[PDB]
Amino acid sequence: HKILLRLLRX
Amino acid sequence: LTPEVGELIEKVRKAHQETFPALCQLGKYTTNNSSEQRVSLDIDLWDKFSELSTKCIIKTVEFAKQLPGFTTLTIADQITLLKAACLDILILRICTRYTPEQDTMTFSDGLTLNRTQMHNAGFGPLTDLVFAFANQLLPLEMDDAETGLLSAICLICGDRQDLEQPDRVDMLQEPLLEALKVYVRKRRPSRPHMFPKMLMKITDLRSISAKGAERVITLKMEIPGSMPPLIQEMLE
Numbered sequence: 121h122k123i124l125l126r127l128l129r130x
Numbered sequence: 131l132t133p134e135v136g137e138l139i140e141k142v143r144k145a146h147q148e149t150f151p152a153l154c155q156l157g158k159y160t161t162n163n164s165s166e167q168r169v170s171l172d173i174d175l176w177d178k179f180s181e182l183s184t185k186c187i188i189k190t191v192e193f194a195k196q197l198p199g200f201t202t203l204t205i206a207d208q209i210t211l212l213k214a215a216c217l218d219i220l221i222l223r224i225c226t227r228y229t230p231e232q233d234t235m236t237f238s239d240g241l242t243l244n245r246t247q248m249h250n251a252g253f254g255p256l257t258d259l260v261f262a263f264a265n266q267l268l269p270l271e272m273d274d275a276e277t278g279l280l281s282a283i284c285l286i287c288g289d290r291q292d293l294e295q296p297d298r299v300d301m302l303q304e305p306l307l308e309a310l311k312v313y314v315r316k317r318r319p320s321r322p323h324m325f326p327k328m329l330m331k332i333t334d335l336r337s338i339s340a341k342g343a344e345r346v347i348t349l350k351m352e353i354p355g356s357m358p359p360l361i362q363e364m365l366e
């Protein structure tokens with residue numbers, strides 16, 4: 121979930 | 131017309147518009163890759179389509195972060211919502227760029243594929259349902275505000291499995307449904323049947339995306355290498 125998270129996390 | 135409703139509509143229309151280039155703004159270009167023959171999977175079409183989908187997933191996440199209250203939910207629930215609505219939003223976006231005369235769909239970089247190429251790129255058995263949905267969508271004459279609201283209603287849905295706070299998501303969706311209802315009546319007052327008709331598209335979208343989840347499965351077997359990282363995260 122990685123990517124996602126990244127993404128997210130913002 | 132209400133002050134709170136007008137702001138919600140403006141925010142969602144702006145979120146959609148700023149993450150979605152319209153067909154009219156793009157410079158359409160075609161490719162010769164198996165344009166006339168139907169095959170199980172065209173590798174060159176698949177690489178272009180998989181990369182374009184990856185970019186579109188990034189835009190859908192940017193769109194979600196601009197929807198009011200979305201970033202206030204738990205990270206777990208944002209992830210659950212984005213994964214559940216992923217195919218619904220990509221399909222609604224590709225179908226918004228449908229050209230009936232040539233029977234084509236245009237991607238965000240301008241790549242325009244015909245029915246046979248969409249089939250060969252990876253849609254396969256999904257193709258006629260996606261194109262039928264595009265034809266049903268076209269007469270609705272939706273604008274950025276309505277497409278954006280339909281996308282937000284599909285994403286912010288409390289019925290998704292494994293939601294930590296489904297009632298919180300239900301509450302967040304209610305202002306969007308109300309905003310869509312008044313906007314549809316304010317923009318098109320002569321036709322008051324448009325609002326539940328627009329909501330029927332969401333049911334069709336969920337049906338197409340349920341079949342789409344099965345297509346991810348059959349595609350993983352046909353494609354040479356593994357699925358792109360972000361696609362694997364969203365659909366597995």
Ligand SMILES: CC1(C)CCC(C)(C)c2cc(C(=O)Nc3ccc(C(=O)O)cc3)ccc21
Pocket residue numbers: 179180182183184186217220221223224236237238239252253256342343345346349361
């Ligand atoms: C389920 C299936 C067949 C396999 C898995 C992936 C490849 C994720 C996929 C993606 C889409 C799709 O609609 N992608 C889009 C790509 C780009 C734009 C744009 O540029 O507007 C819009 C949509 C449809 C079906 C599938």
